[PDB]
Symmetry: D2
Subunit: 488 residues, 4 copies
């Protein structure tokens, strides 16, 4: 028997919904990964219909004429109910609609909250009081941002947890659904070539990089109140840090993984102001179009803002595995490229017998783009030479695994929610540790409003970030030359 | 000032000379790697001339019309002197010819003994007594085979050492001049990713493979008296073992490397007859041409020979790094392919949390063909899967370094002799250890003449070799699927 | 300000109370380790008084005439209330007595349940419903045994947890209060000489020994229904195993320690019947008095009982640290001595250069008697000898720290409860893992009633236990000679 | 058959001979450790007899009336021959005397050179040319000092090696014959508890201490020309360093051990002047007798000497095991005590969970006095405390092994020479490395004559030595309290 499933989309008319969630569920249904008895219900304030949502979401489905019948079958199982985020009557209407659905009484209900943070409390309380299935499971999905600091996030987390259990709350960090971020676990705990060296005795520093080649691009008002830290460093880079630095779990069960992650998080001291390099991007007079403007050139950005669009932060995990190893979280918008990457710079080889011509090994795990794992290693120079040179042992997805289509992170995450897997989701205690690590720094920056180091649009950011990386132990040489091969 | 150099080729009319040595020295001169004042003198019994040697060696030089001037200059500095390997008068004639050479009195003399083993004693004693330069250095080059067993090789080694010092003797193992064999040292002692795991706590077994897709191909008389063991296992695979298993030298000086190599050799017990699988190839009735005949089908092979053309031998290095780790030396002619390869099968990862679907890591260093270093590692299955799958972190020379032309092993070895580097040459004590490891097994096989396990031409050899590998700890699964990529 | 404290002793007239608890609290008060405002209330069915309890407990206080005034001051703060374990009115009487106490409304209440397991449910429910302090904390103490198997213990643990939180429940394992058992943590995680070797790469096997030189000595009816396994192996040896095998906690906080302990417990498979050696002691006809009788010679033991008084069990912790290392739990009553001991037999040293006359290192942590940590190590034979001999690096408490009086385990445990430290107490999940490890074996033994291997009273137990230890990897040589020194 | 042996003592009338060598050979004969056919021949310039040598050496034999018959039997096989150290005729006389001995033609001859360094050349050349046995082996013994610097020692070492082989030369470093110095090898390579931690990843610094509670005590002329460095640091502390830092040999054969020792020596850079603290002791006015005078108060010491009687030197072994670990060689005369000691201060435990009250582990190997191995370790404070405290796991010879009489170093060394064991003797290349390590520093001090830091007689030496130790990484706390136990 196949259990009936319901996919309730809160704020179905929203930007995030029509841009990512509806295409995600359509792709999941298209490949037959959803349960056979799966229905999708849209819920928002706007008085739209199934046809209106269909027309709004078609340009993002990327459908083909060979999938027309699947398209109508998918949309024949779609529904929309208009209502309010605080009026209960709309929620009893939604419950009645779900019960009128085929075998909806025992159907598994799944709620996605694609709504602004201001309405999460009301939506969760109303769902818990009115829209809970009595037979099948009920799992709710909440979306970034998770509060603004330790106390603001803690209050919302406690209100949500007071209503739902930890096995019902699914906090989205869509980078946890990335292919390479999930491959991190297999890399670490399935291979003997990465086990004995994953410690402070061999790793000199850890660099977690997040780059965007574009700035806030017009809508700077939303980014002004958060900044680069709360936007990227607190969640994406920090969860990447947790996965890189975690101990081996007792099993691949979700609870063991999240226990290891929170154990690593609990061993990080609060961020010191002397380990932070903040930058705010200024326009490039040689820039092309959008590159000509800076952050202050956005009309929606209030005048005289000190919000940082670049950050370089050094963290330390005071445990027996990571004692003294700097964890450099370097993120920034309007940089020279787009890149999410894990870089492990290893220590110098002891007893160097190659006359200082060797350089530190670097295991690099590039999450995006061009998913690839390569380790920067010293090989003998090809040809009639004896000196070592920097090379790599490279595994590049998209060349080794061309026929395999790496799915979107949202697809995999929603499939995990359907399957009940909670390994790649944020637990409450992880959120508390993440916010308490960065809260003193955020409060100090807010109260002191320090001036960031301006960096030209499209550049690599402030040079003081490079100075900080050099000071804390990271070695940059610039002599590594890499060429994309051909005619294999 | 550039010192004058002389390249004396003993047995200049020989097969090895005209096939490899003269092209090697021509290539070295062509790229300007030899000293500017370098002359080459040919010496053999046949009454040939410089023109005759030129005509005989041209089809192997692979010269081009753009190099006619360089070829003429190279051959203008070539000379030939006919003589005998036991008559002194010919050797005083050669000495007078070398003195009549431009600044030959202080010229550095280098002797290559491209001669059968039966004349090494006479040639070396005559060279020491008559053909020694009094000002420049004198380095002699002796060639495989080095004796037949412990005592036969020991007598020749002691006789040669009684005439020349260890810094004057250059024992050729042309696999030590291979690109990847020399890259072994950089891989091991220049990278922190291969240091903590290069021990018995992580490596389950070591496999050293030598394969040829052809048999003795007509000239089986020479191979009958030696067999596959003395031909390949005693020198090539064993030196590969020494380089893989050695401790880190104090420096890249030759003496430290050879001390580490002999220290590793001294820790290997004698080969037990129960760890050896011997095979002799029989023709394939479905074979194509030369594949239709077996070893016994060669007319020059004496009737009823039990010589083995395949061998699988398990060795143990009883030291603190390699205690209990089997070193499987598996070599064989008339196999399914040509391949020289170092394979390190690592242990199972402790505390397997992936439900036994992970497999042992394998670091593979393929010496030939298609020089490449790759480590077989477990990555998360690309796509909508969570199970780990076997993959590789691959560095392939000829794709990453296509423009770089990897030189011949003889070129690099002769350049090392010219430069005085003795790291990649066989020391006397290394030869003694190599012969004492295998001598009891060879004597037992000779005195007992056991019947080898026949294997069809072009196959993988006897299946009892795979039984031995499975018994000693090596795990073969056959589920590793690899595809060569394209359009990078 | 010093908060008022109340020490409520349930079953104050009981054997355990008057033998251990009242002397323990008297010793704690005598040294001034209790809070200044501390009162002790006795509660049981018998209609006794403070004077009667005083007279009954004096022979176990070991008081001296120099402590008379402290004795009356201690007993002036003692009180007794008679009642029932199921009648509520007695519990309101106890609550009224506690409120009539000096500042008892806000006093911290501590309950010790020195009662048989049959009444824990009623006592705990009545305490929760009637005897809870509304201002100060309330911590309850429950005593061994914790159920009989997985389900019987689970029902009681769930019932108690339904009434009290994990920070209010204090499960007693008095071996966790032992000096050396607590020193285990400092030994493991405060010293760099015991960190890199505390893993499967160096430890061959782990032996946890519990010996008693006496049998059930008359009261065999209580031991018949439990046996040696439930009595000792399930709690004492298993908690010793957890402390030996645990990972390093994030901090010395109780929750981190108990998380590591339960993580280790979760990695142990269920006990296989082929790894168990069971013995039941038979009398020694050469025995002296009590030693002349066997277990079947006890009149209170039912005829034809197969209960085991000796056990040797091999356990395996399938994690990355302890994969494949046998954990031998060997316990038995009526053995040749009394001894609780942790023994870590290390692996043979790789690359043995001493011609096989070295032996495995053994780090021994003797909990009782004569508390001592010594590591069995190979030193050069003193005198004119070159061979290594077994010796030890010994630290013996009572010789190095003779002036320091090592306190009783109950004293330290009750002081920890007073201070709110819960590191050395059994958590609910630890109990679940402990019972699920041994439940199938206990059920199989009960349903199959196998005949144990008889062993003479005062002997070392069945020899099949030593066969099992030899089979699983433990090496016993018997050549270790030790002499107690003198005149330092 | 027992081969005849001859013990030739050059300079038999000398101080070293009559104080140490004759008692040593008497003790060796008394216990029956010498070969049965062993004779001793004395050789010096003075015209003495066997009776005169007997009377001169009796006060140092420590004989007893129960050993009279053994004493006459020992002296009945003693002989004396007077001669010259350069006249050959005396050496032919000695040879004729040795041949007139019972079966002296094939007797094994052993020469001890208890002579000043000025006559070693003549004595060795004369012994090689005249006093070499043609049947039995001939082993010569040379004594400290071995030259004054690199070139002065190298000339003598090359001259001796030109006459005798390395298996015939026995260079005495009597600290290599000490009990604990020889126990170092068993400690390191027979125990798994000292193997994984004997590296730079766990050891913070190495301290080698040599202390004497007395100064030059009158005969300062001999010490003036050498100083504390050449006297102690170059040989005793440096050989202790070699044994501590060596790699595991392939076997217990002498050649493998000496190869490892020279390999370690070759990895030390020359001593920098900024890592040296030099002191010269000044008298203590509150002094006792000899303690009232300083080094300058010795009449035989030339006025205005800058010779150092204390030294603290930091060395570095740049290899893969000891990269960056300081090796502190701290020696000094007229200090507060006598002590030769190996101290290994380990690194701080990573991820300290004990709030910084733990301290670095120290493995201490006290060579003299009161031979003992103990490791300073952190144990839980005995009693009602939870904080860790410094303790030790102690093995003290003389308490564990009272009945065993630890022999003199000279006894064991001479027994090794008789048995042909050369493990505990200085090879030529070891001497070259030892002298090249310290030669630039010695030459700089000699040419610059810097003023040492005066320290009062009987003190701990200059405080700048403690500043240097603190600067290079060594941590001194002074909170370690140790008490000698009693009534075991
Ligand atoms: N790229 C992304 O957009 C992105 C990425 C990651 C996370 N998220 C998170 O996903 C959630 C979805 O937001 P969004 O990106 O879709 O922004 P949005 O388009 O502004 O919000 C989507 C829906 O929220 C409702 N809404 C808007 N303003 C509201 C208000 N003041 N009070 C109550 N409801 C309101 C609207 O419902 P009606 O149409 O019914 O009025 C709207 O359709 C956000 O919390 C966002 O932080 C978004
Ligand atoms: N692929 C290879 O050929 C190869 C590979 C590795 C090592 N080697 C070694 O290199 C050496 C060169 O031998 P090769 O391969 O050139 O074989 P080869 O052609 O038979 O021998 C070369 C020369 O040796 C001389 N020679 C032959 N038989 C002789 C005899 N009975 N007495 C004295 N001299 C004799 C001849 O000199 P004249 O012409 O002046 O009579 C001949 O020109 C051999 O020892 C071989 O083991 C060869």
């Amino acid at each position: 028997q196949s259990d009936t499933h319901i996919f309730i989309i809160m704020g179905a008319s929203g930007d995030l919904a029509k841009k990512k969630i509806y295409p995600t569920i359509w792709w999941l249904f298209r490949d037959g990964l959803l349960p056979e008895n799966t229905f999708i219900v849209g819920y928002a304030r706007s008085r739209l219909t199934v046809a209106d949502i269909r027309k709004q979401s078609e340009p993002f489905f990327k459908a083909t004429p060979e999938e027309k019948l699947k398209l109508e079958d998918f949309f024949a199982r779609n529904s929309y109910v208009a209502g309010q985020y605080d009026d209960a009557a709309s929620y009893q209407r939604l419950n009645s609609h779900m019960n009128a659905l085929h075998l909806g009484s025992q159907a598994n209900r799944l709620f996605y909250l694609a709504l602004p943070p201001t309405v999460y409390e009301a939506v969760t309380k109303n769902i818990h009081e009115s829209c809970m299935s009595q037979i099948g499971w009920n799992r709710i999905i909440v979306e970034k941002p998770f509060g603004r600091d330790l106390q603001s996030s803690d209050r919302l987390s406690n209100h949500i947890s007071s209503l739902f259990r930890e096995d019902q709350i699914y906090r989205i960090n869509h980078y946890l659904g990335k292919e390479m971020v999930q491959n991190l676990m297999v890399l670490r705990f399935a291979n003997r070539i990465f086990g004995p060296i994953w410690n402070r005795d061999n790793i000199a520093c850890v660099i977690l990089t997040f780059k965007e080649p574009f700035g806030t691009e017009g809508r700077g008002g939303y980014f002004d109140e958060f900044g680069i830290i709360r936007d990227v460093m607190q969640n994406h880079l920090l969860q990447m840090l947790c996965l890189v630095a975690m101990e081996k779990p007792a099993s691949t069960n979700s609870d063991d993984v999240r226990d290891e992650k929170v154990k690593v998080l609990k061993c990080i001291s609060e961020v010191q102001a002397n380990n932070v390099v903040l930058g705010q991007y200024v326009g490039n007079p040689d820039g092309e179009g959008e590159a000509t403007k800076g952050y202050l050139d956005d009309p929606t950005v209030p005048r005289g803002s000190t919000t940082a669009t670049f950050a370089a932060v050094v963290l330390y995990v005071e445990n027996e595995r990571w004692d003294g190893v700097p964890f450099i979280l370097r993120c920034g918008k309007a940089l020279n490229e787009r890149k999410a990457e894990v870089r492990l710079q290893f220590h110098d080889v002891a007893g160097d017998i190659f006359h200082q011509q060797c350089k530190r090994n670097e295991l690099v795990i590039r999450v995006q783009p061009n998913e690839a794992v390569y380790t920067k290693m010293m090989t003998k120079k090809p040809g009639m030479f004896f000196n070592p040179e920097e090379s790599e042992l490279d595994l590049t997805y998209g060349n080794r695994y061309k026929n395999v289509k790496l799915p979107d992170a949202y697809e995999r995450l929603i499939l995990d929610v359907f399957c009940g897997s909670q390994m790649h989701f944020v637990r409450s205690d992880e959120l508390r540790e993440a916010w308490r690590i960065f809260t003193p720094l955020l409060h100090q920056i807010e109260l002191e409003k320090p001036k960031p180091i301006p960096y030209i649009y499209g550049s690599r950011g402030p040079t003081e970030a490079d100075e900080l990386m050099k000071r804390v132990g990271f070695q940059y040489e610039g002599t590594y030359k890499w060429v994309n091969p051909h005619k294999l």
